[PDB]
Amino acid sequence: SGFRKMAFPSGKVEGCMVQVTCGTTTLNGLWLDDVVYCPRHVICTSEDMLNPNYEDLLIRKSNHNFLVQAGNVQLRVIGHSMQNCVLKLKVDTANPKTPKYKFVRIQPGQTFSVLACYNGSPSGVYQCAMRPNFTIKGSFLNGSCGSVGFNIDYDCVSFCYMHHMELPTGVHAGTDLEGNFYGPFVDRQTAQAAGTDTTITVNVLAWLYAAVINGDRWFLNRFTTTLNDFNLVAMKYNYEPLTQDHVDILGPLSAQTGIAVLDMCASLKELLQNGMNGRTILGSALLEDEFTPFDVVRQCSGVT
Amino acid sequence: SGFRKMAFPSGKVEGCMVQVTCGTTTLNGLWLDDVVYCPRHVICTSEDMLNPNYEDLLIRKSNHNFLVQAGNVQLRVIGHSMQNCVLKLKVDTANPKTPKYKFVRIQPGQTFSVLACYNGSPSGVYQCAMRPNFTIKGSFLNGSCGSVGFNIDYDCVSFCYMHHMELPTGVHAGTDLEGNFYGPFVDRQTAQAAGTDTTITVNVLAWLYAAVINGDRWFLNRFTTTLNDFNLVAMKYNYEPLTQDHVDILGPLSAQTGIAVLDMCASLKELLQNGMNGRTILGSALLEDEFTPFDVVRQCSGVT
Ligand SMILES: O=C(Nc1nncn1C1CC1)[C@@H]1CCOc2ccc(Cl)cc21
Ligand SMILES: O=C(Nc1nncn1C1CC1)[C@@H]1CCOc2ccc(Cl)cc21
Predict the structure, then answer these.
(1) A-chain residue closest to B277, CA distance
(2) CATH number at residue A33
(3) B140 touches A at CB < 8 Å
(4) Exposed/middle/buried for A51, CB within 10 Å: 0-12, 13-18, 19+?
(5) Angle at which helices B293-301 and B201-213 cross, to 10°
(6) Is residue B147 located within the same domain as residue B217?
């Protein structure tokens, strides 16, 4: 028993991290097969970032200007192309440590692991949720750009995120591996509004089920609610409206614990309206939303 | 910016995980050089666990009874020895993925990463603190035994923990890699008191410094305190007494932020006495103690 904010084992992704330098800028790249993926802003100077014309900036660059280093060996760049906000550097050598992989665009509310890197070297790994407003609350310093987010289903790594920037508000923005930003963001040093964020209701409910499985039950009450009634409370507390699709995804946890989804919604309703009264749930003094129902089942069943 | 409960990249440890089976029991082993380390209770049946005589149980076992499997290949066992609560299985092949490593006994209050495994396969990675009472609050199911805790300083993995058991209270107990339990615990299915736990004061202060560095400053006040005054509050709130050694370790963070350690102690004192008033610090509604001062400096400086 016990419940932790667990990240995927990062080994398969560590073997793909490289350092990419263009001019005076160094960031991280992802080497998969004979292609290295990195944020296109590697071609900019901090000065260019105010309003970069990436097409014009990239035209001044040649294959030999992109220095790609994997550990201590240099990779020979034989092609370069920009796809949305990422650069794809074709190298002459396929990465021998390339795992089975996929590029996926995750949905808001879904979770993933981030392998934070600097100069192509891994520094740490943590579990994130893509916020409903398409930002992530990460831990990223200068040079972390190009660090990736991913999920792993047995031997296949699904890469879902590449880090590009920190907004003036301190939250993080990035792209899928085709270079499409999650959210309205642009790779430019300008003030950018991230939308109103909300709490991922289905994840809080999944985490309440994890609490019951792992022994924390003080919050269970004698009440029930309806999707309509619960959603009036979710509206007031800036929670995502619960749908039947969310109730359906909670099915396995509801079956495991014997607690009907709407009964768990009534516990959540009372927690929203009354707070925790100085108590904790799974070591937390707030309602946690960075665990999906799939994460709870996975962690509680020991999937490797 | 941003501050996360970051684990070390687990790759170097993933390459050392093996499955060890003896009779009907399967757990995880750590393969380093030509030795596989695992909890000695792999030789027990669930029935033997009430009061096992490990010496007698091990005498009925031969090298061929220990099935060690690394991925899909079988390792040939040529020796077996029990050292405290661990078994050391000498194999005929050195692990080709053996990283530079050390076995270290960490101190209470120090942190480490756990690579949770089942059947020799990694399931996830999370960052833990060894509690002052020598337990850890992990996420471990049946078969997780033998999963290890570790730290990494550039290319050297310092293994500090091997998981053995879950106490009736749901907290976890284990040994260093020489098989010596952290705490008063015995590898036997009996009720075992874990001592009164306390909050790791120096870690809460380190985390408050991390909060200031990363923008959360609402808790800073116009007050100061003394080690004596602060310790009277620490006593009342079940916090570890702060010493000059702890103040000394906080030196770099104090220098970085310009906030004297005793001024940060006065902020902590007011937070203990008044609570958070429904506010958060680094996304938490409680005082976090699972980040050491070294962790804060490391994360805030991007050490890889
Ligand atoms: O955001 C960026 N860096 C960043 N992203 N995660 C961590 N960090 C560092 C600041 C802490 C760069 C530098 C700031 O100016 C920009 C502007 C646009 C773009 Cl795409 C990137 C950048
Ligand atoms: O504790 C153990 N298992 C455990 N440790 N982390 C997770 N888990 C499973 C229960 C959830 C085993 C089984 C219970 O009985 C004992 C007794 C003594 C020893 Cl050393 C091990 C054990």
Answers:
(1) A278
(2) 2.40.10.10
(3) yes
(4) exposed
(5) 20
(6) no
